Design a protein around this nucleic acid. Sequence first.
RNA 1: AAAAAAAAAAAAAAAAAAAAAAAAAAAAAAAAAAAAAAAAAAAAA
Lengths: 415, 421, 52
Amino acid sequence: SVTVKRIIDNTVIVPKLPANEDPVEYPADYFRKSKEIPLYINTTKSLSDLRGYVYQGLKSGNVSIIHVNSYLYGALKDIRGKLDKDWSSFGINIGKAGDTIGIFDLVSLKALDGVLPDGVSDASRTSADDKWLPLYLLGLYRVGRTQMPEYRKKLMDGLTNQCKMINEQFEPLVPEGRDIFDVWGNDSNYTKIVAAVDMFFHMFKKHECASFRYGTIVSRFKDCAALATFGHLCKITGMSTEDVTTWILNREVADEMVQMMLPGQEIDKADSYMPYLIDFGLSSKSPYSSVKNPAFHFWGQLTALLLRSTRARNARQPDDIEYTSLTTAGLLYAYAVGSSADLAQQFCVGDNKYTPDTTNAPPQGRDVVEWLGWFEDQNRKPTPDMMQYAKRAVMSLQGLREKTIGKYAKSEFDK
Amino acid sequence: SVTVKRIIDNTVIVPKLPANEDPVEYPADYFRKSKEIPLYINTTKSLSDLRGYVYQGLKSGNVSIIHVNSYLYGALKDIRGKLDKDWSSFGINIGKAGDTIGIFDLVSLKALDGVLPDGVSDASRTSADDKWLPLYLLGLYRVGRTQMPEYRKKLMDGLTNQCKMINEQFEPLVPEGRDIFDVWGNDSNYTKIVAAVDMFFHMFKKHECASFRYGTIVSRFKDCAALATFGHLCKITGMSTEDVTTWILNREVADEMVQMMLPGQEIDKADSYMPYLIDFGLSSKSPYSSVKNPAFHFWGQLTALLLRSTRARNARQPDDIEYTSLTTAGLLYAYAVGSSADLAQQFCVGDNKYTPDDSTGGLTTNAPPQGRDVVEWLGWFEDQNRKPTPDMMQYAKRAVMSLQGLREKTIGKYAKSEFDK
Amino acid sequence: QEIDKADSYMPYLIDFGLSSKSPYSSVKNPAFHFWGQLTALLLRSTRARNAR
RNA sequence: AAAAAAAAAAAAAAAAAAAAAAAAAAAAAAAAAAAAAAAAAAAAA
């Protein structure tokens, strides 16, 4: 099939179609360029000052990102945090035995010239400062990324978090529109700050100010949905990462799995940079994204859904994937895991179930090959019970959002 | 399966995935550091005073936790309480024979410098003091932890409790939001106080002021839900702790059970510190929590639910657990316990049911097992091609149909959907 | 014609006025457009649902 | 009389799409919208 030809007149034709570039970009394969995550923050000038440029700047539609940036640098040099262990990543040392370090031993710079208010926007603001203001500011990263009454859900609670040994009201005017400060997202250095705040308090989980991760948290594995629906599939099938992996039954799902699992990227690593590849700008097209792993994302979720997952219910149904092979392979894996439970006596009193005491009855366990065999044995077309299993998984599901694998499954199966 | 490889091009791949730290932390394995539960209470200055700093501080959005803390220390030195028995825990002596002791023989300190009002908030408040004000204050720990019209339920009654023998009325303004004083929770020393008040009155259950446990009670086994749904499963299957244990049929449920049952932690102990591991800060990630025991929590409740438990109805359905093996193993245990009751003559008059009659019969086959032995049932289940039977799934659908008012994301709502249709 | 080409002019044949009747259009490829979408639709396509 | 898509200028074609996205998932701790104790027919001269 490298070479197609029309039959009646017997002329060639080259079916070609619009290319589709943007390769992925891995964390590691970027520290092969630079060894530092440059955080340009400019006005290393007064903090007492900057604290004001932002309190006032926020109670109105205009506060410069460049200012909030610099404000955060100011509030966040709680050089607190004693590395009880070591800490490196991708070559980058960060601190060895017990070394005392702060949120920014992740390589600071300083940039350009333009900055708004003069000397003092107002003397009002005391150091009811770090206490919350940064929290609140970082928390707007989280709010900015969203779109439905979750925005007001997210703000309204990402605003009872500054009522924590503070007390207060709530600032800035317009609800949302992904517009009011949803631009901070677009700011290379802002993202770098939240990414650092999280990566830091992620490490020093017990810190007093660790409460700050409230908004800074949606940064960890930002754009790594498929990576995370992998881990969820595993957890929801109770199966091991490797055994789940064998259950991948489509070239372009395995292609993506291969792309995700690429080594020396610190995926699995305790406290690595990788989770923040996107916000630290180590990558501008993450290889763990739903969108670069559409087939994997669909399958893994559809499967988990069938296996009673609450999450998957609402996972988006990626477009331009082969739906009618991904679902089949999902159904099967779901069926396998589903029908044939994992029951096994765990405790006893000298007495336990030594277990080694029909035609076409589904396979004993969860071996891919046992099941593939069984399926081929099924003329390669999903069986009545399994399709019933599927219809039992999805009927009774209500409140399904359009274009989710949830709504997909229910339509594919309940009728 | 340590080593996976792609087939067509035959290259390796290492399926790895984001790690997941926060280990648990046990009570015991903390007194291997310190032998004291340090209650930093700073302003050991006047009480008549502090009683005011809080009465007024509360009738308004601003009262310092540091103040309530110190106020409680003041009101709660009812050094009352005669240890009729002994009393130790984790090495810590607390009082031997006849020893007379009070709520704070649990190791007090004193801290920093900042404190709000000057000399006198207002001379108003008499010693209509301990009588309730502490109760009320402690009661707000309980209220703070919550989220639905239970808040107003909980306050509205955790406020007819100060109308007791004292008859003194309701206070601050805003309903809730987990915000108004729901921050006292975050206070290391506050929690330590309520934890001590409970642990104490828990011991001296008959004390006059024991009425104080009203709010201080949600502290005992705070973050130990799986531990408690274990006990409930037991109670609800009438089975013994050990026989219930054998009925655990999933690696990760047993792993959790093992983690829970870890010895020398005083779980089972009369009046131990363990129940308060969280609030005394003996632990910052309790090993008895629903969340560190997700599979155990699910199973145990789902099962209990099936066995008619009223509680389980509303237990949350933990995420990222294997739902379709936990339910199977739950259904099975439920079925076992359910179908085959526990009937046996208990009393008589010289005449009783000798039960071993020549047990030869007709249902010569596949009828579910006589009793509740795991192995008898496992066998039977394997005998069932390892797929839950019609009656047992009917038993399940009888358990859950007719259940109404099920909350979303509870094992209740789960079971009804899994079974009623 | 550089259809498949990375960054070619072809995608803009219309707007660059390189063409005033594009050979890739639904309208000059009515049968192909129908078939391909109808098919895709059957194969669960979300897009095709709304193709004219 | 003349007519006959309440067709149509073309060009057109997802009431698709900036990029990045992807549970309208999440500080963490939790987890019966259980629970002072005592009780518990919203039973009773």
